[PDB]
Amino acid sequence: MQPFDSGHDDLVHDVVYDFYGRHVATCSSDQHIKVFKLDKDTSNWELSDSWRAHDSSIVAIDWASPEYGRIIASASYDKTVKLWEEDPDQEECSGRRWNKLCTLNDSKGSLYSVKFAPAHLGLKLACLGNDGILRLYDALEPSDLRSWTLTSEMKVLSIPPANHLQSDFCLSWCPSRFSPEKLAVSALEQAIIYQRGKDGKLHVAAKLPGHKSLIRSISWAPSIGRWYQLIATGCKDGRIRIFKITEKNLQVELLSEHDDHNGEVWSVSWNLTGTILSSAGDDGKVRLWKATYSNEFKCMSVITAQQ
Amino acid sequence: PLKFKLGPLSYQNMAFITAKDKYKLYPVRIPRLDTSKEFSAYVSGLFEIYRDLGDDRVFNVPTIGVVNSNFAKEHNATVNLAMEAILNELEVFIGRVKDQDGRVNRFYELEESLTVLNCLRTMYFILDGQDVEENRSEFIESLLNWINRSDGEPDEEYIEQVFSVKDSTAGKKVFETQYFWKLLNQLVLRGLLSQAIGCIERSDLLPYLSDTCAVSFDAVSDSIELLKQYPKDSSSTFREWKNLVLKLSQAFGSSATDISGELRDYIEDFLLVIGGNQRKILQYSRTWYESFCGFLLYYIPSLELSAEYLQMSLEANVVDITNDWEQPCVDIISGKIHSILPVMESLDSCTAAFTAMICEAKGMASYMLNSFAFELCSLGDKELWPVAIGLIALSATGTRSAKKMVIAELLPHYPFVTNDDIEWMLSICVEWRLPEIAKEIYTTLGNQMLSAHNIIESIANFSRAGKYELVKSYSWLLFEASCMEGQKLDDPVLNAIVSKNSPAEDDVIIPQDILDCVVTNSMRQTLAPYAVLSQFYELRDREDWGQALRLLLLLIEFPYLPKHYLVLLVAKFLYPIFLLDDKKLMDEDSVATVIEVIETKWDDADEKSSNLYETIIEADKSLPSSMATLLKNLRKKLNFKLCQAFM
């Protein structure tokens, strides 16, 4: 294990595993995405490649599933998502193995997020920007990664994001296609669950209540152990709120709500087996939560690090 | 400020800092998870056993009616043997662990796990769930064996320490003072009878007296004699027992012995007071097992009302925590934190879930097997994938009537990158009757092989699915590339199509030295147009001009080969080799048929043909500029071919 320096010269905005979790990509204000492949031997992330994937700061990076090959979408403040495919037989340690699939000039504002749809719901990506426009992109084919059509736009935030409305804003999908297609979107205090109608225009299907403060992360749980959903939110007041959404249109219920960071919970991140939530928040400590047989999540462990 | 990202991995999470000059990232594990080979091999032993257990060991009612006497025997037998076997695989894991360093702490955590299992064992998997006082032989022996391994009190180290104390009362030996009888009585109370007989021997008790006048020996002999005997069956069993166990002290107290005022006084008093009064038994109990056994065996003294008595004994004075259900919990709480959290809330107490579990039952271990195994799959430890499906197949879990939508989600979510992983996916698809997901898997695999630079494995993968449209598209990819040279591109393709389903050609296929598939692979049907191109090349080398031309025309006429491969086959092959053709005689029919195909399919523009034309030129120009430059020139060579057949 042990401390390692990523070698980024500016700050790390994101850490994203592959869907198989064989790669970690980090993105920074130094215009690079650095992609590391997992050496199990040292249990460290060893530098595979580094390239400028935009001519500005990279603030959202996300992996698509290695089930169509490795695709990178990356969001920058230069107004474009740039799409990249990994070739092994292209050179590594040079940035010659990421061939640009496209440049999408379909984003009229500067991006702050781009996030892939799970394998199970089809290859789609959502955008959000600093013009406050939720963008729904559908690839025309799962094997044609070089075009993506804007299929829907929904004006989320009441006031656009500006130099003081600037916060973490997050895009998360619904991993189940045995649940109607949706994507929960957190912007400020409101988390609004959007659902695809049968008319091919997105509608508001639900609103998540009980958000007393800004949502700094929203993460939709894969429905595993049960076929219902759970969405966790990390909020600024040290609250982990796990609400359960049952499918009967959507019902809203609480599962549990508890607060233990007590400063601000910055990130919520569910595992892919949808049974362990790990949250971190202000105070520098990571709390690892596992369900009881009273059917509620409780803190099983506390890891303390640096600030 | 710290942010943490939980991936699918279960052993390799990431914590990071969003701050400048804080570009250091710290790998974080989840405690109590091991990806070790010792751990999966432990799991592998438990898996065979766990499966074979069936619906037994969850406490079913053992029927003895007509439906079905045999079931009672089967249920009691299976669970008991399964316990023995679980302990041995458990020893094997533990043994590996206490031979490595930094697993000095782990070694200790596993001795506690053994203790909870020993208490459980004594009651139900020794006795067989029978009477409290069924087996005596197996009870004593198993307990003694366990205390030896579960706990660390060597028959040696323990009793050396105890014999080293003898000072601070009198300067006289250990057996002449309290220290020895306090132990001796304890060993008897913990059912450590073997060690207790030895303790008398070691101490030097036997030389030291050599007198006595004990009458209680003869009594006990003759009593047990008549007793066990039965002159026709006598009710005197329990009555006599009760009398005997109590009367012992008083007889000793009168019997002459030539020993000091130390030894005697002590022994008399001690023996009396202890095994005389309920409290004094508990006073000297320094463990739960001492108290627990002690009353049944040594007080009032065969299985009668020993129930009520033991209950009351406990209820009055509390005795030291050991490792039971709630007991390691009560140990743990005061202790370190990480434990106490997950520890609590796992006992059937103030809950509804574990109430619900045993009432329906009368499969937690099975659930654990199907829980742990899945967690490891989501990390990439392939060893537990066989384990997972295997428990499902027999001693099945899940319903194929509603848990189909949950199980469906797991197949694509989990990192598949071995063979075992891949075989597991297919295995589950057959079993739950969803073939369509397996076909999707094969599509998904081709799509990986396309971006991993395998234009062989991809084709095979798509071929499995049986969709003619996709196979054809790759053949065409490839057919096109091999048109800029007068041989089939590379050699393994080449080899394989020309060796046919006969052992022809000595040319080894692929970069392997194998002759094995040089007796198989007869490119036919779908691969037939592709096969015919490679063979046209063989024919030039085996100097045929006639059959060569014929194969090239056959493909040009075929209306399911692309139209954009017109200007390509004729430009490279027919155009230079104008002479060889010209020599040959062509009739009215062959000429007119070739001509229709040119009229319909030849392209002077289009995507593919503009690009292919740019490259022909770069190779060796046939036409300077314009495709249908060619048409004019061709017709001249054609007038001559036509004229020469006719003269």
Side-chain angles (χ1 to χ4, degrees):
Chain A
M1 291 291 175
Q2 283 68 255
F4 77 95
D5 188 356
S6 57
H8 281 316
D9 302 5
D10 288 317
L11 47 55
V12 179
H13 302 260
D14 209 7
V15 169
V16 279
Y17 287 73
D18 207 19
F19 179 56
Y20 289 183
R22 286 187 301 138
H23 297 250
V24 165
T26 44
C27 64
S28 294
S29 330
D30 58 4
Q31 280 69 233
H32 304 296
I33 303 168
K34 275 180 165 68
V35 163
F36 303 93
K37 72 309 197 173
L38 182 42
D39 190 11
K40 302 85 188 186
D41 291 331
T42 50
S43 286
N44 278 118
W45 300 78
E46 290 303 97
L47 185 57
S48 296
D49 207 23
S50 183
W51 92 112
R52 303 147 66 80
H54 291 275
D55 312 315
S56 302
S57 310
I58 311 175
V59 298
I61 194 277
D62 187 23
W63 297 79
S65 52
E67 291 193 304
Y68 303 140
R70 284 56 64 205
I71 312 180
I72 292 288
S74 45
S76 169
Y77 302 124
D78 70 3
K79 303 177 153 204
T80 51
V81 180
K82 283 171 190 182
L83 281 296
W84 317 93
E85 177 55 65
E86 204 186 304
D87 283 357
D89 307 339
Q90 290 310 75
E91 282 304 320
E92 49 190 89
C93 301
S94 44
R96 289 184 283 135
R97 57 166 196 196
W98 291 116
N99 303 356
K100 174 199 293 313
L101 294 147
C102 42
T103 313
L104 310 163
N105 298 69
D106 277 356
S107 287
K108 298 68 55 61
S110 300
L111 293 96
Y112 206 93
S113 188
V114 67
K115 290 298 183 191
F116 286 93
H120 289 196
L121 208 74
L123 186 63
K124 293 175 201 296
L125 46 87
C127 297
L128 181 49
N130 305 156
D131 60 7
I133 300 280
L134 166 59
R135 316 181 180 77
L136 214 286
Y137 283 87
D138 282 7
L140 291 74
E141 282 180 321
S143 57
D144 181 22
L145 311 166
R146 311 195 70 98
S147 50
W148 299 68
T149 54
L150 289 175
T151 47
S152 178
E153 280 182 335
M154 303 303 283
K155 179 25 160 177
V156 188
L157 303 89
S158 298
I159 33 186
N163 294 331
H164 43 102
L165 306 168
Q166 272 340 126
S167 299
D168 289 10
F169 298 113
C170 287
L171 296 168
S172 188
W173 283 79
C174 176
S176 199
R177 69 287 195 173
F178 308 114
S179 306
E181 162 171 58
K182 284 186 295 278
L183 63 146
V185 172
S186 55
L188 306 183
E189 306 194 82
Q190 304 299 264
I192 300 290
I193 310 183
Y194 295 91
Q195 174 171 239
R196 181 48 60 119
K198 58 293 301 179
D199 71 336
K201 280 304 311 185
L202 292 168
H203 58 277
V204 180
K207 63 296 293 65
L208 294 179
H211 296 131
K212 312 181 176 174
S213 69
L214 303 67
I215 307 138
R216 306 310 291 197
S217 180
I218 186 153
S219 274
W220 211 311
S223 58
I224 290 169
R226 71 312 153 197
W227 64 288
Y228 296 156
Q229 293 312 133
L230 293 156
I231 297 187
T233 56
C235 296
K236 42 176 270 175
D237 46 353
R239 275 282 165 171
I240 311 74
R241 321 167 187 284
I242 301 168
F243 308 96
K244 172 176 58 51
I245 311 106
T246 59
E247 301 91 77
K248 298 306 181 200
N249 190 247
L250 299 308
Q251 300 303 309
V252 186
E253 288 186 59
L254 55 79
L255 204 292
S256 60
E257 307 176 53
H258 43 67
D259 46 308
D260 185 25
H261 289 68
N262 309 112
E264 138 169 72
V265 164
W266 291 102
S267 281
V268 283
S269 285
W270 296 106
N271 68 348
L272 188 64
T273 337
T275 187
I276 305 184
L277 173 63
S278 182
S279 75
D282 172 37
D283 64 335
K285 319 188 224 182
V286 176
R287 288 169 180 80
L288 310 174
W289 300 81
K290 312 193 167 186
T292 50
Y293 302 98
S294 287
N295 306 126
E296 61 187 291
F297 284 65
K298 292 197 198 178
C299 183
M300 298 308 186
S301 181
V302 183
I303 294 299
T304 191
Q306 319 294 271
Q307 298 300 152
Chain B
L2 181 145
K3 294 179 89 174
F4 181 86
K5 281 284 161 301
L6 189 49
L9 313 192
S10 300
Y11 190 81
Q12 169 55 266
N13 309 134
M14 189 59 89
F16 58 107
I17 319 299
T18 313
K20 292 296 194 78
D21 303 345
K22 289 306 309 191
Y23 315 121
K24 306 317 181 276
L25 261 74
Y26 308 131
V28 193
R29 50 202 304 182
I30 305 181
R32 288 287 183 75
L33 185 146
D34 288 348
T35 301
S36 298
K37 313 296 302 200
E38 310 177 347
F39 187 83
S40 303
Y42 174 54
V43 166
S44 281
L46 295 174
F47 145 66
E48 291 178 266
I49 310 153
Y50 296 140
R51 189 181 64 258
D52 280 336
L53 270 164
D55 294 351
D56 299 0
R57 181 177 65 83
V58 76
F59 292 91
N60 288 120
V61 160
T63 44
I64 63 162
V66 56
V67 185
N68 167 35
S69 174
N70 314 118
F71 179 53
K73 295 78 179 285
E74 297 172 358
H75 169 69
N76 289 104
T78 45
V79 83
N80 300 359
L81 292 195
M83 178 65 151
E84 292 178 283
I86 289 152
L87 290 162
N88 294 342
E89 269 308 322
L90 175 60
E91 279 301 288
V92 166
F93 178 90
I94 287 183
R96 287 175 298 200
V97 170
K98 61 189 167 164
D99 296 346
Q100 44 178 187
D101 291 351
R103 306 285 291 247
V104 287
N105 306 324
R106 185 43 170 294
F107 162 31
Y108 310 144
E109 290 147 48
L110 300 172
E111 294 171 358
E112 304 182 315
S113 287
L114 299 170
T115 315
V116 164
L117 302 172
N118 180 24
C119 177
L120 173 63
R121 176 164 185 77
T122 46
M123 282 303 274
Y124 296 109
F125 304 129
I126 278 285
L127 291 176
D128 304 353
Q130 312 302 97
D131 287 338
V132 192
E133 291 198 33
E134 176 46 88
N135 304 320
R136 315 281 69 249
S137 304
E138 290 189 308
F139 189 101
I140 295 297
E141 298 168 15
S142 57
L143 180 71
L144 166 121
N145 191 229
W146 287 116
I147 304 300
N148 299 181
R149 311 301 297 182
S150 177
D151 289 345
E153 288 178 359
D155 55 356
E156 45 202 65
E157 299 197 277
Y158 196 38
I159 295 166
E160 191 53 76
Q161 278 167 95
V162 168
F163 303 159
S164 181
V165 175
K166 44 162 187 52
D167 284 354
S168 314
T169 274
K172 293 317 192 72
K173 296 307 302 308
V174 55
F175 56 96
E176 315 184 61
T177 55
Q178 47 178 242
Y179 312 115
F180 182 42
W181 308 104
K182 286 194 310 185
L183 176 77
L184 190 54
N185 184 100
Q186 158 185 70
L187 290 158
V188 172
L189 288 191
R190 288 183 177 145
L192 297 171
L193 292 156
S194 180
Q195 289 164 54
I197 279 138
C199 300
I200 299 166
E201 284 159 78
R202 166 176 184 179
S203 56
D204 307 355
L205 193 86
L206 325 176
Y208 191 98
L209 282 88
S210 304
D211 293 308
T212 67
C213 191
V215 75
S216 55
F217 183 83
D218 191 22
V220 158
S221 295
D222 179 50
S223 62
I224 296 184
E225 293 278 294
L226 183 54
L227 199 147
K228 213 165 293 193
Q229 176 186 142
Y230 293 127
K232 203 55 72 173
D233 179 13
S234 285
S235 161
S236 67
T237 300
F238 51 87
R239 307 174 279 150
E240 294 176 288
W241 290 117
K242 282 187 304 287
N243 291 354
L244 288 176
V245 175
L246 291 173
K247 293 171 54 74
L248 171 62
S249 186
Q250 303 316 108
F252 186 64
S254 318
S255 60
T257 321
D258 281 333
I259 44 168
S260 203
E262 274 191 64
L263 187 61
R264 189 73 164 277
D265 288 15
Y266 300 127
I267 301 174
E268 281 172 352
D269 170 329
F270 189 88
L271 191 51
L272 185 55
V273 162
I274 289 186
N277 174 208
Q278 303 181 76
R279 189 48 178 86
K280 298 310 302 295
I281 304 175
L282 310 139
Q283 190 76 237
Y284 290 97
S285 297
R286 300 189 272 274
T287 42
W288 181 89
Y289 301 120
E290 271 193 69
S291 162
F292 176 80
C293 293
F295 284 85
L296 295 163
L297 294 190
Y298 298 130
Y299 178 61
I300 282 291
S302 295
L303 185 47
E304 288 176 73
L305 310 180
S306 312
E308 306 189 44
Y309 303 154
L310 179 50
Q311 265 74 77
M312 292 181 184
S313 305
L314 287 167
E315 288 166 80
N317 175 61
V318 80
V319 295
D320 189 24
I321 55 186
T322 53
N323 303 133
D324 304 328
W325 64 299
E326 86 201 334
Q327 279 37 92
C329 190
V330 160
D331 201 13
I332 281 307
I333 53 175
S334 32
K336 284 303 308 177
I337 37 152
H338 300 279
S339 311
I340 113 167
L341 301 172
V343 164
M344 299 171 300
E345 187 51 48
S346 296
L347 300 171
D348 171 33
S349 297
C350 310
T351 197
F354 285 119
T355 320
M357 280 298 279
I358 199 67
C359 289
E360 294 169 298
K362 176 75 155 64
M364 173 60 181
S366 300
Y367 180 87
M368 292 301 302
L369 180 62
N370 300 1
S371 301
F372 289 130
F374 298 126
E375 295 272 271
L376 270 299
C377 306
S378 194
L379 165 61
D381 189 352
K382 71 185 184 297
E383 283 170 283
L384 288 83
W385 296 57
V387 180
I389 195 257
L391 289 161
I392 308 166
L394 292 179
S395 66
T397 58
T399 69
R400 302 93 190 190
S401 296
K403 290 310 296 304
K404 50 185 59 174
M405 38 165 128
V406 182
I407 287 164
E409 289 175 76
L410 311 175
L411 338 174
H413 282 338
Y414 303 160
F416 59 84
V417 68
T418 48
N419 297 346
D420 298 358
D421 292 3
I422 302 182
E423 293 152 20
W424 182 82
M425 285 194 298
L426 305 176
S427 194
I428 300 271
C429 302
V430 168
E431 192 170 82
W432 286 51
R433 302 73 46 176
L434 315 167
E436 293 292 287
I437 300 314
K439 291 289 184 279
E440 292 173 8
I441 289 143
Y442 304 148
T443 273
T444 274
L445 200 56
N447 301 322
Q448 297 160 224
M449 304 288 184
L450 194 53
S451 287
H453 297 298
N454 289 79
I455 312 302
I456 40 176
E457 301 307 295
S458 177
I459 305 174
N461 292 355
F462 294 125
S463 303
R464 292 204 289 277
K467 190 175 197 306
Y468 306 128
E469 278 54 68
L470 323 167
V471 186
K472 290 179 298 166
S473 60
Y474 306 117
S475 300
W476 305 163
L477 183 54
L478 266 184
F479 176 108
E480 160 181 65
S482 57
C483 291
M484 306 293 320
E485 71 199 87
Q487 292 299 116
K488 172 57 54 177
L489 174 61
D490 295 307
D491 295 310
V493 183
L494 197 157
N495 295 344
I497 292 144
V498 185
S499 59
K500 298 298 180 172
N501 221 311
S502 47
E505 294 181 305
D506 293 337
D507 297 342
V508 311
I509 180 168
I510 54 155
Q512 293 326 286
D513 78 347
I514 59 172
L515 213 76
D516 298 8
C517 286
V518 188
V519 191
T520 56
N521 305 146
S522 181
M523 271 68 262
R524 185 42 65 222
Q525 44 188 80
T526 316
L527 307 320
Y530 199 41
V532 164
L533 188 44
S534 192
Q535 287 184 128
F536 144 83
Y537 304 144
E538 303 292 316
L539 286 173
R540 296 147 53 187
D541 289 346
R542 297 172 308 190
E543 285 170 330
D544 283 345
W545 304 108
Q547 308 321 314
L549 160 74
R550 189 181 55 98
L551 309 203
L552 183 65
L553 299 170
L554 191 45
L555 290 192
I556 289 167
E557 300 173 305
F558 189 49
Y560 300 145
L561 187 65
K563 48 180 299 77
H564 291 307
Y565 291 159
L566 263 282
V567 193
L568 173 53
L569 298 167
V570 187
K572 287 307 286 170
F573 304 120
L574 282 155
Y575 192 95
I577 305 295
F578 271 161
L579 296 323
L580 288 299
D581 310 331
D582 195 31
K583 300 301 190 303
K584 307 195 292 284
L585 312 177
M586 289 71 178
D587 79 343
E588 157 152 41
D589 290 14
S590 61
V591 164
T593 56
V594 152
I595 282 163
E596 178 70 279
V597 172
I598 285 166
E599 279 171 17
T600 50
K601 293 179 61 183
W602 188 268
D603 307 315
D604 302 338
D606 298 4
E607 199 191 60
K608 292 316 296 189
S609 305
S610 280
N611 304 324
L612 288 162
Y613 181 47
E614 297 234 269
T615 54
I616 295 158
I617 303 158
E618 300 171 74
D620 179 6
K621 51 191 299 306
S622 302
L623 292 337
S625 52
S626 176
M627 284 80 156
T629 310
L630 200 130
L631 191 62
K632 294 198 309 315
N633 320 314
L634 167 65
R635 191 59 255 207
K636 309 319 180 178
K637 290 317 299 296
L638 283 167
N639 292 347
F640 301 131
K641 294 152 198 186
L642 188 51
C643 285
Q644 304 165 14
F646 288 181
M647 67 174 80

